[PDB]
Amino acid sequence: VTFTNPLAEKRADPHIFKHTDGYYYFTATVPEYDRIVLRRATTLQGLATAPETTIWTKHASGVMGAHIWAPEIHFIDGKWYVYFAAGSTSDVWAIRMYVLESGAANPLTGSWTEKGQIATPVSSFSLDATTFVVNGVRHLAWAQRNPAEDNNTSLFIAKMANPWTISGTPTEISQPTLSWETVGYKVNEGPAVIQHGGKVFLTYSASATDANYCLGMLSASASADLLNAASWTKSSQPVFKTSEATGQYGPGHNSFTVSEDGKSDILVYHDRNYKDISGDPLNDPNRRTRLQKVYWNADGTPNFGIPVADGVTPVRFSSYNYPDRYIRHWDFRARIEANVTNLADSQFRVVTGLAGSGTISLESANYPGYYLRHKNYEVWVEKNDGSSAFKNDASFSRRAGLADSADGIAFESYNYPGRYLRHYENLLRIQPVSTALDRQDATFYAEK
Ligand SMILES: [N-]=[N+]=N[C@@H]1O[C@@H](CO)[C@H](O)[C@H]1O
Ligand SMILES: [N-]=[N+]=N[C@@H]1O[C@@H](CO)[C@H](O)[C@H]1O
Ligand SMILES: [N-]=[N+]=N[C@@H]1O[C@@H](CO)[C@H](O)[C@H]1O
Ligand SMILES: [N-]=[N+]=N[C@@H]1O[C@@H](CO)[C@H](O)[C@H]1O
Ligand SMILES: [Cl-]
Ligand code: NA
């Protein structure tokens, strides 16, 4: 259920589609911007080592012959469709949207038919076509220049007549006007749609593709007219952005997939592990593809948290007797609490114990190098200073749950044996367990 990031080096604008043939299909922008690659695997982690087939290469002359950008693969009405953007050999900045089609069972080995340009009423810079279905009605969303606006691209949506043709007229549903949307360039690009609880959430990327790259989001009700701009409300702050603490910079151009069991939504995105671009921004090849689980807030909105540290993804721990309440820190004091808005406060990664002897330690996701540790029997999230005292205070023996020895987890203090991590008045402590309540207070679940 956890992932190891990054999923793929030197792959930007990642798109993963989970098909009914029990495979995931992964396409992405390559640094040479010259072809469309594809890989498949039965699991998300499998993708990291799956070999890439080149399914289509740029034309030698004319259209579809430059800047092959941001492919997406979809299965629609028994056929495969690939959406991408391309300029021409003559005008490399006349980027337009194109579609490929294959009828083959396996798209990696099939042959592809070019269905041509997705025509729009305005002849202007267009890219990042995505398709999605709301109440059985297929839509296209994309980024395009509105020439009467002083910016790079705005977001558009339209109904579709077929997978390569819009129906009716587009609606512009967002334009880059907030300060975090306008750093370097005034950009709204990379639309991506996830549906949950009767709402449509359309994330998109904003600002220059540097450390300022981030995700904003539009929200609408699935029952509303998606072609009425008034149905969409823009989030006033980014929903996903650079985290210096975790060394993740300019996360963006995302897509959405689902876990192996189909139970969890997965955020698929790119970023860099450094802040400042060297050379022509466009020529920096180092963006990499990453995966993390999407968590749903009580109000029904998605919570993407922060881009997590490289390596294994962190987990959340819920209480046995208060199954809605999660271990989280606030002012560095550990507690249990429901409906954690600052998600990363409730994410921890399980690492080999700082004090050895087969113990475990719980590293903070938003404060790497900080760990759950006790002091005077109270539990805090504090920075490891390298002292023996800290390492002892931050190490625990994993035990079978005290109220659930099958599925539950308990955490026995390494330096105070017989004292367990337990909540009391919602604050976390290390205390002995004698009573039935004590045992419940000391039992937790990871990602249940
Ligand atoms: N110059 N320029 N345009 C850049 O390239 C476009 C695609 O990312 C974005 O609008 C912007 O970052
Ligand atoms: N103040 N404040 N912020 C809280 O304190 C930080 C440390 O626990 C948490 O990340 C944050 O939610
Ligand atoms: N007692 N005492 N000392 C303090 O409390 C112990 C238990 O939290 C810690 O090891 C130490 O910080
Ligand atoms: N309040 N109170 N009682 C304590 O607080 C509850 C929540 O921490 C614990 O289950 C219980 O031990
Ligand atoms: Cl919160
Ligand atoms: Na996309």
Swiss-Prot record:
Its main location: secreted. GO terms for cellular component: extracellular region. Optimum temperature is 45 degrees Celsius. The active site is at D13, E189. Changing D128 to A/N: Abolishes catalytic activity. One of its GO terms (biological process) is arabinan catabolic process. Involved in the degradation of arabinan and is a key enzyme in the complete degradation of the plant cell wall. Catalyzes only the cleavage of terminal alpha-(1->5) arabinofuranosyl bonds of arabinan present in the arabinofuranosyl polysaccharides or oligosaccharides. It cannot act on other arabinose-containing polysaccharides and arabinoxylo-oligosaccharides. This is Extracellular exo-alpha-(1->5)-L-arabinofuranosidase. It comes from Streptomyces avermitilis (strain ATCC 31267 / DSM 46492 / JCM 5070 / NBRC 14893 / NCIMB 12804 / NRRL 8165 / MA-4680).
